[PDB]
Amino acid sequence: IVPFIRSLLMPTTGPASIPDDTLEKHTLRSETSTYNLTVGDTGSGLIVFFPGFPGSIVGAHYTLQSNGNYKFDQMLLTAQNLPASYNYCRLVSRSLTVRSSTLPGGNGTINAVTFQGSLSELTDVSYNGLMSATANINDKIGNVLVGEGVTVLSLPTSYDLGYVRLGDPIPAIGLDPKMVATCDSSDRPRVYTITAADDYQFSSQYQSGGVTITLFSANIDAITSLSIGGELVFHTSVHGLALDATIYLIGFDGTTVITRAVASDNGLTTGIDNLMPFNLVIPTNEITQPITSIKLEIVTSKSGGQAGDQMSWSASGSLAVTIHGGNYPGALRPVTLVAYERVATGSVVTVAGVSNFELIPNPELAKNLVTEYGRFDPGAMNYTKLILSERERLGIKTVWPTREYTDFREYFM
Amino acid sequence: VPFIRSLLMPTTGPASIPDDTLEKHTLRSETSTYNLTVGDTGSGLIVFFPGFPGSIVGAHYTLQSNGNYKFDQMLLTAQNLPASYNYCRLVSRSLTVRSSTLPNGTINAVTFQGSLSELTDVSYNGLMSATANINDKIGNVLVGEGVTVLSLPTSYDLGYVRLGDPIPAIGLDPKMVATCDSSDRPRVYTITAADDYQFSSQYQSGGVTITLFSANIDAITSLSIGGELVFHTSVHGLALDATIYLIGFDGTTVITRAVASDNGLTTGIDNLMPFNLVIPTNEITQPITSIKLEIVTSKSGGQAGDQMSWSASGSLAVTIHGGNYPGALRPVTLVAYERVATGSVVTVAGVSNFELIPNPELAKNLVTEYGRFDPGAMNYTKLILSERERLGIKTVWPTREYTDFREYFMEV
Amino acid sequence: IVPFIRSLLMPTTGPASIPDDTLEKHTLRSETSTYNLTVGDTGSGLIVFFPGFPGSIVGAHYTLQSNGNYKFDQMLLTAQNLPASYNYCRLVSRSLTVRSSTLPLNGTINAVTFQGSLSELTDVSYNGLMSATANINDKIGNVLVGEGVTVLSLPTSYDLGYVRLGDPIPAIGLDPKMVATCDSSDRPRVYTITAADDYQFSSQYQSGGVTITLFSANIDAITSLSIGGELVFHTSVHGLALDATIYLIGFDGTTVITRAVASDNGLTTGIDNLMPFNLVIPTNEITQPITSIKLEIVTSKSGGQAGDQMSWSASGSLAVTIHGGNYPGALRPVTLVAYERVATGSVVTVAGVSNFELIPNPELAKNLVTEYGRFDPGAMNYTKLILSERERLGIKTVWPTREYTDFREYFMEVA
Amino acid sequence: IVPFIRSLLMPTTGPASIPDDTLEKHTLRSETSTYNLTVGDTGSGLIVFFPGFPGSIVGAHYTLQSNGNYKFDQMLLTAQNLPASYNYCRLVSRSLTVRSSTLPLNGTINAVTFQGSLSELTDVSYNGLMSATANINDKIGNVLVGEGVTVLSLPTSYDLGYVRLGDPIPAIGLDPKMVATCDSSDRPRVYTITAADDYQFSSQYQSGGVTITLFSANIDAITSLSIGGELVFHTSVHGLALDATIYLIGFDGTTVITRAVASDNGLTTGIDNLMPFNLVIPTNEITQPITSIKLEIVTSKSGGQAGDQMSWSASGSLAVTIHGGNYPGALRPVTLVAYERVATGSVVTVAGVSNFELIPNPELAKNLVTEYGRFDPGAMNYTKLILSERERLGIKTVWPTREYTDFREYFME
Ligand SMILES: [Ca+2]
Ligand SMILES: [Ca+2]
């Protein structure tokens, strides 16, 4: 059969060019992913996969703790870091399997679902709640035995997608040995607009150390670089007030991933528009785990203050959070969650997969890597469209009990 | 071929676009129904955004005796799509405009390939020249018979657009608003407001105000304004106040933002005035068609004779989020009416068809799919459009003719 | 051409037997509906149709008042009252047109077919109606009143049973106002209201008893219903007595039926005080469609001390049974035709036809022959094919009359 | 291949419209069911399934206790609560698998499909179940728990009407605990109990009153029901008062619901003393399936003293109405899956799919399109043919999972 269809439904067989109209000279590659994750003491956990991610980020593993909160374990990537060798990329196909491979010195089920939004948009991430994230029967699978395993297959979220910049490093020199410079995924940014205050009235008695408040908290999604811009305007009738403002980017496990000062001892002048601008740039290397929320903290203070003293101000303002390349299909959505429970503590949950890409090499590699437009295959796209339209009749799933996927592979070959 | 049917006869329902943008989606039809009231001049203008990917369908303006237009209201779909969906693509759309009441009149309509503020003439007769395409203009149709606006493609293989849906958020402010906006394909305007511009004037209690510039730009949904102005001065004690105004098609101020407040200028130094503005969609009450910057110069302890002066250089960048997404700002279809009896009702009725992706809550009960495979649908669409002139497929029609066209199609 | 499809799509042509498996000896009849309704001073109104109603009730007309409330005008029925001549019935097909016929261009109509019953609509405004359904072929907007709209009844299931019509039964009584009927009953609709689950009431007295509305709920009824169940009261205060009244409210907010449930029911301390509901509301008492039910309870202590604390705790569930209410077409679906900007005093004209399968009452049976009805081998499959291609064929439940007329021509040519 | 037959025999592949004459505009949905049940200390238990239930109730789990009694564990439902989003429903197809997934080889399963409702079973022991039916294709014995059993729902009539889901209706009340719904009602089941026909009661006084259980009867209820009727009492003795209570008992012997029918009802001599029944038991109050009803009557003599005679004669009938009880699938049939010898603490995993034809509630109707559904000329005939050849084809209601799997292959080819 058509090579692309083969690649699409059976990624582990290798790559093939997407039969669309995005004619770029490129090269084809397969990157494997292999992880042996350890089960925590509740025997429950969650793996978040970004099936359509155009690059080396495959997912993240979280363990569920006794207190009911998740805790970040680690990212799941490809064998090598693509940005080190390539500058542009497009995802061709991908599949990963998750199954237990071990038992601790002398158990378990999986629920999985493919959600059409991004991580922070899920309304329920519990083992059982997941089963309702989507209404599509072929995008959910329940109570599969961990030992048999589940297979996650990436299905398209649009074709004729452009190539994505990989966040490759660029030629640069600096005084700081820690300096970092890259060209990021940017085309198709996602933008969140937050009006944190519209004549919001703040009022409180002085207090040594200042009074702190969290003006707002909002769910947003970010895996790679983002920028935060905009401004808050403050009004006050009180003399001697100074502000300290800090933005926090929170991870899926509730921990603080990034903190940035926005205002430091910003004094407020009476009867005037006090401007507090935001000029934040958060680079990818600082994001240690997926960001799922953003909150603003403001600390109001008065230097020569006394117990009882009045500190008050009114504020108005909007921020814009720009996730570079955030709306590129596959970059933040969709998400495939694989949850496991009742697995013996200390067991090994093994992840193994392949990702196939269309790539454009970086300058150094371009000297030795030939690139081409790729096999003309007249009916490949029509066939793909036919297959996907008949998705329900053919039973092509995004999540499968591995045994069934294997049977499906035979019935295909 | 369902797509062709939906495209040319939107009121029959939606169909998936036969392109290569394969996303699991659902198909929906949203109606638009309005009974607009005719002002005392008997003249008015309806501005339609034929390709708008979402719930905004147009805006109504009445023409006043003084010759200026006055904003009436927005024209939307029956329900607010962003409340139920996160992503969208326009499949097809058509709207009819005709008089339904007597308490007379004609219509001129045209489809302009730019955005609203780019039109050079918006008068009832002037519109007839906005385009050279005979199939994109229609003149003096009787208001009682009506006109039909049909949405024709401005590119396929367009991506799904974020709808400006609300995101989960909690804040101390009850008026707090948080959304994920239409962003892909931003439109960017760059304005160099000053390049060593010399300002000079004699003191004056209260300060001296100048409008540094005024420019035409278009915006319906969120936008941001960044950049900076740099000021130089040899005079001591000067302070600046600067404000940005976003103006509506009717000349009214829609939005004001302080950019500088009592910003004092130091001598022999680069005085920086940054712009960090974000204008959310909920604040835009009517389409924005221009932007202007105001600077007020002042000297606190000054006396007559004192000379106020500074030199400035600087550039701003106005980013209209998702502004260049085809259909978001351009094209525009204008339907103008005149000589209609005052107090009459101009009735608008239409259908909008979309490919949509449900929000998280609705996704729990709404099944999404890739959509019928129809091998020759795109080729047939391309053939029809290339023979557009020979087939007479218009973007604006005298309704009677559109109706005949519908019959001649269902019988072919 | 298959008579049934012809009847279904063009009801005014006459009846035909439903090609299903409900083989009963019956007769076929057509009842017309004709009304000249008057437009109120706001120029806005609403006609509610019960497109699938198995009997003579076609709809109800309401005018919109200056204050924003609707006001009941009258019921729309068939030329004759079917229950007076027949005992059983099945709806075959039905169509109605609504248009302005007089002048004292003066108006628009929005119409929609909702898959629930009247009280379940979330928005009944002229423009809100456009969203009641997502089906593009079950809604129509801003049609000129002079051209008009056509309501076409599409099936909500076949192989439906015959419905009892609410015919009079032989009876004699001392009361001249006595009424006895055999009612539509198969497939009742049942609403269960747990009005209170240890609800705590405590109120200051007030002359005449402190009155509260324990609860209010949306329910639908056009014909007889019964209300059963019981409330159990507990109290530590002596001398309290309760008055309870069930109220059945119309779509216009007016009280349609009121029934005493408790009258001077005294409450004994430290004991389960029982308040049973044994209500039967007969069809002839319902003057307009019911859209809500409320329980008013008046608590009184024997003294009469303005301000005297009153208290009791209550628990209970009531069951509201709408006889035959779940029979498809009896309460759902509903087709609403709203009009606005019509000149005050104009006449909105309604004209239609209802087709039925009927079983005559005893007296008429002596002269009306009944039969099983034409065998037509492919009629049901043809129907199913047509309905499954409903969107492709554009078969609507609401149409701009001009289009429906074109559709009829396009049909009589092929056949 | 007929989608409907595919759905019917292989529910996990998704829904299809029933090819009968109930032509309603509807939508099609699949709801999964996933449960990890824990085995008690006897290593024995019972799962009761309602294979044809038109809605979200799939079944109930009971553990067998050392004393030989069952104990209710929990209900087994679909992933989401259908009555919250839809108002009407029809069951298209359904299948569930039951197998052990953990070990802290242990155990066997016996399963049977009984044509009555739960309380009508004459024997619910692990081995007794094998006789509940004579149909060889509706019973299966000693399947290993590790391999598992598959319950397949087979029709109990077509051309069934849509069922009201017990959805909430718009209502407001003084009580925050107020509940109001439109219940499954078409085709009610009615039990008529003549509790007494001039029954003579006589007993010596006792401080506290004398208690008797006039009668006890097996009835079945899962959702709302009402009890009506009346008892008439006669007596020659002065000063007697009665207390009467109705108790609705669960399958495990526990009291699920209690209602006072008479409280301090005094008896007047030489007159007909009326004791009406006006009970309405809403669904939310039924915590587990009801399998019996009993009436308790406490006779007391106010000014009574030791030695006092107490007596009365009674006559009466009650009518218990189970709303929608006789709708095929609502109470009957029932499929019982029993397991024994399973290691205590093991997990018995349940995983299934339910397919429905539904009508959305008013809010969802604004965004969910409904249709009549694919015309498929021979689907019904093919279904009738298949079912008539049920024995020859070996189409079972309960299967050893391995065989069901083979059956699926033999069908897809
Ligand atoms: Ca393309
Ligand atoms: Ca039948």
GROMACS .gro file of C-alpha atoms in nm, chain A residues 31-239:
model
  209
   31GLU     CA    1   1.331   0.933   1.649
   32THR     CA    2   1.266   0.671   1.912
   33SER     CA    3   1.146   0.740   2.269
   34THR     CA    4   1.227   0.495   2.547
   35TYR     CA    5   1.156   0.537   2.916
   36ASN     CA    6   1.136   0.317   3.224
   37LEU     CA    7   0.921   0.512   3.470
   38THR     CA    8   0.893   0.418   3.838
   39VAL     CA    9   0.554   0.385   4.010
   40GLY     CA   10   0.516   0.589   4.330
   41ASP     CA   11   0.356   0.471   4.652
   42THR     CA   12  -0.010   0.520   4.566
   43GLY     CA   13   0.038   0.295   4.259
   44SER     CA   14  -0.126   0.569   4.047
   45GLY     CA   15  -0.001   0.813   3.794
   46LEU     CA   16  -0.054   1.009   3.478
   47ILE     CA   17   0.140   1.043   3.154
   48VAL     CA   18   0.052   1.344   2.944
   49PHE     CA   19   0.137   1.299   2.575
   50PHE     CA   20   0.142   1.573   2.310
   51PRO     CA   21   0.069   1.344   2.014
   52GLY     CA   22   0.104   1.616   1.758
   53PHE     CA   23   0.405   1.799   1.893
   54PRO     CA   24   0.627   1.910   1.607
   55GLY     CA   25   0.964   1.829   1.768
   56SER     CA   26   1.132   1.642   2.053
   57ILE     CA   27   0.884   1.692   2.335
   58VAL     CA   28   0.674   1.377   2.358
   59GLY     CA   29   0.515   1.410   2.701
   60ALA     CA   30   0.543   1.439   3.079
   61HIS     CA   31   0.502   1.187   3.363
   62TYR     CA   32   0.326   1.274   3.690
   63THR     CA   33   0.284   1.048   3.994
   64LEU     CA   34  -0.030   1.076   4.206
   65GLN     CA   35   0.044   1.138   4.572
   66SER     CA   36  -0.132   1.022   4.889
   67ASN     CA   37  -0.272   1.371   4.944
   68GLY     CA   38  -0.445   1.364   4.608
   69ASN     CA   39  -0.209   1.602   4.421
   70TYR     CA   40   0.003   1.509   4.125
   71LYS     CA   41   0.381   1.557   4.137
   72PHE     CA   42   0.599   1.614   3.834
   73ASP     CA   43   0.848   1.335   3.761
   74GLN     CA   44   1.009   1.414   3.423
   75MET     CA   45   0.966   1.505   3.060
   76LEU     CA   46   0.951   1.238   2.792
   77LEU     CA   47   1.154   1.337   2.483
   78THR     CA   48   1.298   1.180   2.169
   79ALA     CA   49   1.634   0.993   2.170
   80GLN     CA   50   1.815   1.299   2.047
   81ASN     CA   51   1.742   1.670   2.075
   82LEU     CA   52   1.626   1.768   1.728
   83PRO     CA   53   1.696   2.141   1.769
   84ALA     CA   54   2.066   2.062   1.794
   85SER     CA   55   2.071   1.930   1.437
   86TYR     CA   56   1.771   2.077   1.261
   87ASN     CA   57   1.601   2.412   1.227
   88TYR     CA   58   1.260   2.322   1.085
   89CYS     CA   59   1.020   2.037   1.135
   90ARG     CA   60   0.680   1.881   1.059
   91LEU     CA   61   0.533   1.574   1.233
   92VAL     CA   62   0.455   1.290   0.990
   93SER     CA   63   0.341   1.016   1.227
   94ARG     CA   64   0.388   0.882   1.578
   95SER     CA   65   0.294   0.602   1.813
   96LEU     CA   66   0.392   0.510   2.168
   97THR     CA   67   0.310   0.209   2.383
   98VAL     CA   68   0.276   0.210   2.762
   99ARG     CA   69   0.290  -0.114   2.960
  100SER     CA   70   0.431  -0.243   3.285
  101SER     CA   71   0.750  -0.451   3.245
  102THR     CA   72   0.825  -0.534   3.610
  103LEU     CA   73   0.724  -0.658   3.962
  104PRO     CA   74   0.903  -0.549   4.294
  105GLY     CA   75   1.068  -0.839   4.487
  106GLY     CA   76   0.805  -1.113   4.529
  107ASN     CA   77  -0.159  -0.555   3.948
  108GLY     CA   78  -0.293  -0.253   3.750
  109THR     CA   79  -0.519  -0.091   3.492
  110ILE     CA   80  -0.498   0.195   3.239
  111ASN     CA   81  -0.762   0.445   3.124
  112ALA     CA   82  -0.661   0.663   2.829
  113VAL     CA   83  -0.824   0.938   2.632
  114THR     CA   84  -0.746   1.191   2.360
  115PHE     CA   85  -0.873   1.536   2.448
  116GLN     CA   86  -0.914   1.802   2.183
  117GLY     CA   87  -0.786   2.087   2.398
  118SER     CA   88  -0.462   2.158   2.579
  119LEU     CA   89  -0.362   2.030   2.921
  120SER     CA   90  -0.503   2.311   3.138
  121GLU     CA   91  -0.840   2.291   2.963
  122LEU     CA   92  -0.923   1.946   3.097
  123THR     CA   93  -1.206   1.968   3.352
  124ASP     CA   94  -1.128   1.642   3.533
  125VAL     CA   95  -0.795   1.461   3.538
  126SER     CA   96  -0.881   1.174   3.768
  127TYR     CA   97  -0.833   0.815   3.654
  128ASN     CA   98  -1.208   0.777   3.604
  129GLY     CA   99  -1.299   1.129   3.508
  130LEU     CA  100  -1.083   1.104   3.198
  131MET     CA  101  -1.330   0.871   3.031
  132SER     CA  102  -1.562   1.165   2.962
  133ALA     CA  103  -1.305   1.416   2.826
  134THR     CA  104  -1.430   1.334   2.477
  135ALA     CA  105  -1.750   1.189   2.339
  136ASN     CA  106  -1.573   1.002   2.061
  137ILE     CA  107  -1.572   0.632   2.135
  138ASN     CA  108  -1.251   0.586   1.931
  139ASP     CA  109  -1.058   0.839   2.139
  140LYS     CA  110  -1.095   0.667   2.478
  141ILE     CA  111  -1.011   0.325   2.616
  142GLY     CA  112  -1.086   0.189   2.962
  143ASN     CA  113  -0.947  -0.051   3.217
  144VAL     CA  114  -0.685  -0.209   2.996
  145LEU     CA  115  -0.454  -0.435   3.197
  146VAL     CA  116  -0.121  -0.263   3.254
  147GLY     CA  117   0.071  -0.576   3.160
  148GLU     CA  118  -0.098  -0.589   2.820
  149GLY     CA  119  -0.055  -0.219   2.764
  150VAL     CA  120  -0.202   0.060   2.563
  151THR     CA  121  -0.090   0.208   2.233
  152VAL     CA  122  -0.122   0.578   2.156
  153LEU     CA  123  -0.148   0.655   1.787
  154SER     CA  124  -0.121   1.012   1.654
  155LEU     CA  125  -0.400   1.104   1.412
  156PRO     CA  126  -0.386   1.433   1.215
  157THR     CA  127  -0.520   1.766   1.330
  158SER     CA  128  -0.491   1.917   0.982
  159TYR     CA  129  -0.253   1.883   0.694
  160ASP     CA  130  -0.078   2.148   0.484
  161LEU     CA  131   0.072   2.264   0.808
  162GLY     CA  132   0.382   2.477   0.772
  163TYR     CA  133   0.724   2.374   0.888
  164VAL     CA  134   0.789   2.473   1.249
  165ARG     CA  135   1.111   2.650   1.370
  166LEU     CA  136   1.257   2.409   1.630
  167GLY     CA  137   1.401   2.643   1.887
  168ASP     CA  138   1.747   2.572   1.747
  169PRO     CA  139   2.041   2.764   1.895
  170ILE     CA  140   2.170   3.058   1.691
  171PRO     CA  141   2.533   3.186   1.652
  172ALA     CA  142   2.594   3.412   1.949
  173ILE     CA  143   2.867   3.521   2.190
  174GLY     CA  144   2.835   3.679   2.530
  175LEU     CA  145   3.008   3.776   2.854
  176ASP     CA  146   2.780   3.545   3.043
  177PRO     CA  147   2.877   3.176   2.997
  178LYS     CA  148   2.510   3.099   3.073
  179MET     CA  149   2.388   3.298   2.777
  180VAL     CA  150   2.130   3.126   2.553
  181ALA     CA  151   2.006   3.225   2.208
  182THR     CA  152   1.756   3.043   1.990
  183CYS     CA  153   1.515   3.081   1.696
  184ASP     CA  154   1.176   2.965   1.830
  185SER     CA  155   0.858   2.801   1.717
  186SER     CA  156   0.659   3.111   1.641
  187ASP     CA  157   0.420   3.089   1.342
  188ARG     CA  158   0.060   3.069   1.460
  189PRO     CA  159   0.092   3.216   1.813
  190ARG     CA  160  -0.175   3.157   2.077
  191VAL     CA  161  -0.283   3.472   2.259
  192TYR     CA  162  -0.460   3.501   2.594
  193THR     CA  163  -0.603   3.836   2.697
  194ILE     CA  164  -0.664   3.905   3.063
  195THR     CA  165  -0.825   4.212   3.204
  196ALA     CA  166  -0.699   4.179   3.560
  197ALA     CA  167  -0.877   4.490   3.683
  198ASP     CA  168  -1.141   4.740   3.576
  199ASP     CA  169  -1.142   5.010   3.844
  200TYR     CA  170  -1.065   4.752   4.103
  201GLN     CA  171  -1.068   4.906   4.455
  202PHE     CA  172  -0.802   4.784   4.694
  203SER     CA  173  -0.798   4.888   5.058
  204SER     CA  174  -0.616   4.760   5.370
  205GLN     CA  175  -0.462   4.857   5.705
  206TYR     CA  176  -0.081   4.893   5.695
  207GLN     CA  177   0.132   4.602   5.812
  208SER     CA  178   0.507   4.566   5.842
  209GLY     CA  179   0.624   4.376   5.534
  210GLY     CA  180   0.335   4.499   5.321
  211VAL     CA  181  -0.002   4.351   5.239
  212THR     CA  182  -0.008   4.090   4.962
  213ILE     CA  183  -0.289   3.995   4.732
  214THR     CA  184  -0.328   3.770   4.430
  215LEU     CA  185  -0.530   3.988   4.186
  216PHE     CA  186  -0.619   3.699   3.953
  217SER     CA  187  -0.528   3.344   3.854
  218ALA     CA  188  -0.597   3.197   3.511
  219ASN     CA  189  -0.543   2.872   3.325
  220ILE     CA  190  -0.315   2.894   3.021
  221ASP     CA  191  -0.086   2.647   2.848
  222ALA     CA  192   0.280   2.666   2.767
  223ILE     CA  193   0.558   2.416   2.695
  224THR     CA  194   0.799   2.650   2.517
  225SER     CA  195   0.880   3.025   2.510
  226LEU     CA  196   0.611   3.285   2.575
  227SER     CA  197   0.597   3.656   2.635
  228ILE     CA  198   0.382   3.862   2.869
  229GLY     CA  199   0.296   4.222   2.778
  230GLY     CA  200   0.051   4.493   2.874
  231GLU     CA  201   0.006   4.720   3.169
  232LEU     CA  202  -0.171   4.807   3.486
  233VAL     CA  203  -0.263   5.165   3.573
  234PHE     CA  204  -0.290   5.260   3.940
  235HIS     CA  205  -0.472   5.556   4.104
  236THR     CA  206  -0.443   5.658   4.470
  237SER     CA  207  -0.531   5.941   4.708
  238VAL     CA  208  -0.290   5.816   4.976
  239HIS     CA  209   0.068   5.944   4.989
   0.00000   0.00000   0.00000
